[PDB]
């Protein structure tokens, strides 16, 4: 019977709330009240990137902090050189419709996708010196939103068909896959201990994966509308994510609740893009009315802004050693703030 | 030194990418959209994963593009699709039962936040089924429009055809201009399912399109 | 957590009346645009009628134009539907969807099988 197993279900949801209410008896904020504030921080554009035709979703830092590849829908995966502003490749893609990029903890690789539902490996090293596929991965049926390298063998990607796979990319073979999303995926963060991972969906609600067991560990809600970014902690016990409500909610896996949110009556539009400090003090979302804004993640008063763009933002990233912060947009130049 | 090769490294790429610039403007992209029973397959294999097809006419190159590989959401990857010349849009107007769907996506596009300044070509297959289901009495447009009972016209067999397919294109075009301020237009046509003129009428509508950019950027208009 | 609850079917001899409500919880009702959809025996999802924001723009579907009333009572956050002749071919499960959003005038995917936004429903039969 159904209703008995609803009946069940609500029972065990009730009792949940009361238990979370019991451990809900103070606030983050409240805590925090005593500490100093950051004051006001100004950042200036120092370094500006073009030759991009089309806009862009796409960006990511290498380790070596230096070079960075961010992908574009004219067909074109292009790695910089940030100190120098030097193009070393220009990669040309079969499918001109690429969602996603990624970049190698060795440097040795990236890889890319989209709408084609294939994930593509690109080699930087080969013995001839030029660049070609290494490798494609294929079994999803929708799209794919984000992708990132665990190790030189071993990637991890998400895909709208609201599941998440790992692969083998010598064997070419899903190792395990990862179901119990409703909703699509739309946005994933590995862990820094490389064993577990987040992915928010299309349903309010970030699920806690075990990499090694293929289990839902931990489920948060408390969004009301999409889900579009999400990122750990510096210390890798929680994690920010923002949506569509154009609020950023800061979560904590040990106390397993919402800890505290951050919103302005004067932002009616969505998130896309979220990302840490080195310290993870301070906290940069990018925003659909063409700015990014600066939140104190302890104290939540907006401490400075970035509006150095007219049109939407859609990729931000924060070096290893968070020396550079850099903005790309659909304006089709990447911007490297400091 | 390192720096002379850093140098010479980006001077070749520069000279590709001209080259792409001159051959990516050149062509124009569109957007095929209708329903399982719509013929956008047949309206594609006309002038014959995502299915791609490239047709040349008047010495101008048209790339057209259909994706139907997808799930039955559609509000997250829609979006890719905002710097499209214009979205094909093809409707079935000799089924009455769900015409009203087709009524609820053409609003949804028109006033969608990123597809504001995209212009739509209205394509209105199975004029020859129409035809000959209203002649024959079987099926009235009235049971599902009651409008329909105090409508004018503005075919030559019976005026009522030309009342009927008159009235559902009058139905299309009242959603077009009751929210607008003239930066995109709708253009419909009457096509049956056997015909070789689509290619052109394509052509058409996008010089048009092309012309008011060029004139508003001009301060002409 | 979003969290939309129905009530109101039963069985109705032809020519009736009935009132359908829902409650919704978890979410500022003002800011979103509510519709609501029936599904018939061995049939896909239909769309009956949308209400605004504030109410100031309501539509029916044309086969029912005349017969349904939607209503909407943002002080006490529900939503409500008063049926009047009721056809023999009236009978199907009814469920109360909501737009993706907050704010756009843009209703994508509320028919889709597998939205995410949806009551649970109620059946009705004459």
């Known amino acids: 019977e159904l209703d008995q197993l609803r009946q069940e279900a609500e029972q065990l949801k009730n009792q949940i709330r009361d238990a979370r209410k019991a451990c809900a008896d103070a606030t983050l904020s409240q805590i925090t009240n005593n500490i100093d504030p950051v004051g006001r921080i100004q950042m200036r554009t120092r370094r500006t990137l073009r030759g991009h035709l089309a806009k862009i979703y796409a960006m990511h830092w290498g380790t070596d902090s230096r070079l960075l590849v961010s992908a574009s829908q004219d067909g074109k995966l292009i790695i910089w050189d940030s100190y120098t502003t030097n193009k070393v490749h220009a990669i040309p893609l079969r499918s001109s419709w690429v969602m996603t990029c990624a970049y190698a903890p060795s440097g040795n690789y990236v890889a890319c996708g989209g709408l084609d539902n294939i994930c593509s490996i690109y080699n930087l090293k080969t013995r001839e010196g030029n660049v070609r596929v290494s490798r494609e991965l294929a079994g999803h049926t929708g799209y794919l939103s984000c992708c990132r390298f665990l190790d030189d063998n071993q990637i991890v990607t998400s895909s709208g068909d609201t599941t998440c796979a790992l692969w083998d990319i010598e064997t070419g073979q899903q190792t395990t896959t990862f179901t119990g999303h409703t909703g699509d995926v739309m946005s994933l963060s590995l862990a820094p201990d490389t064993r577990l991972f987040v992915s928010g969906a299309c349903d309010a609600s970030a699920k806690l994966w075990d990499v090694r067991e293929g289990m839902c560990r931990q489920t948060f809600t408390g969004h009301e509308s999409d889900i579009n970014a999400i990122c750990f902690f510096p210390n890798g016990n929680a994690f920010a994510t923002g949506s569509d409500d154009a609020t950023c909610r800061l979560f904590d896996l040990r106390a397993d609740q919402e800890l505290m949110t951050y919103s302005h009556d004067n932002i009616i539009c969505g998130i896309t893009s979220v990302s840490f400090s080195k310290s993870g003090r301070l906290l940069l979302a990018g925003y659909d009315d063409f700015n990014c804004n600066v939140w104190d993640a302890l104290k939540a008063d907006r401490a400075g802004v970035l509006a150095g763009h007219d049109n939407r933002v859609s990729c931000l990233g924060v070096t290893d050693d968070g020396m550079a912060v850099a903005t790309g947009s659909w304006d089709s130049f990447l911007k490297i703030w400091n | 030194n390192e720096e002379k090769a850093q140098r010479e490294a980006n001077k070749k790429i520069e000279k590709q990418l001209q080259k792409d610039k001159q051959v990516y403007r050149a062509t124009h992209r569109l957007l095929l959209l209708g329903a399982d029973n719509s013929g956008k397959s047949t309206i594609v294999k006309q002038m014959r994963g995502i299915f791609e097809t490239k047709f040349q006419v008047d010495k101008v190159n048209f790339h057209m593009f259909d994706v139907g590989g997808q799930r039955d959401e559609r509000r997250k990857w829609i979006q890719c699709f905002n710097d499209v010349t214009a979205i094909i849009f093809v409707v079935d107007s000799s089924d009455y039962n769900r015409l009203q769907e087709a009524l609820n996506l053409f609003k949804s596009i028109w006033n969608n936040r990123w597809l504001r300044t995209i212009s739509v070509i209205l394509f209105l297959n199975k004029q020859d089924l129409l035809a000959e289901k209203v002649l024959a009495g079987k099926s009235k447009i009235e049971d599902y429009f009651p409008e329909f009972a105090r409508y004018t016209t503005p075919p030559g067999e019976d005026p009522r055809v030309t009342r009927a397919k008159y009235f559902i294109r009058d139905e299309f075009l009242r959603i077009s201009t009751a929210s607008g301020d003239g930066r995109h237009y709708c253009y419909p046509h009457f096509t049956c399912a056997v015909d070789t003129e689509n290619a052109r009428r394509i052509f058409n509508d996008c010089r048009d399109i092309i012309q008011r950019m060029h004139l508003r950027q001009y301060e002409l208009l | 957590q979003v969290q939309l609850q129905e009530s109101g079917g039963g069985l109705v001899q032809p020519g009736g009346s009935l009132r359908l409500s829902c409650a919704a919880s978890?979410?500022?009702?003002?800011?979103?645009?509510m519709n609501w959809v029936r599904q018939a025996p061995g049939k896909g999802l239909e769309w009956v009628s949308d209400i605004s924001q504030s109410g100031a723009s309501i539509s029916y579907t044309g086969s029912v134009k005349g017969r349904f009333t939607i209503s909407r009572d943002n002080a006490k956050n529900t939503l409500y539907l008063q049926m009047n002749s009721l056809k023999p071919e009236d009978t199907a499960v009814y469920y109360c969807?909501?737009?993706?959003?907050?704010?756009?005038?843009?209703?994508?995917?509320?028919?889709?099988?597998?939205?995410?936004?949806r009551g649970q429903g109620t059946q009705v039969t004459v």
């Open positions: 969807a909501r737009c993706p959003a907050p704010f756009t005038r843009d209703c994508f995917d509320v028919t889709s099988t597998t939205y995410a936004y």
């Open positions: 978890g979410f500022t009702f003002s800011n979103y645009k």
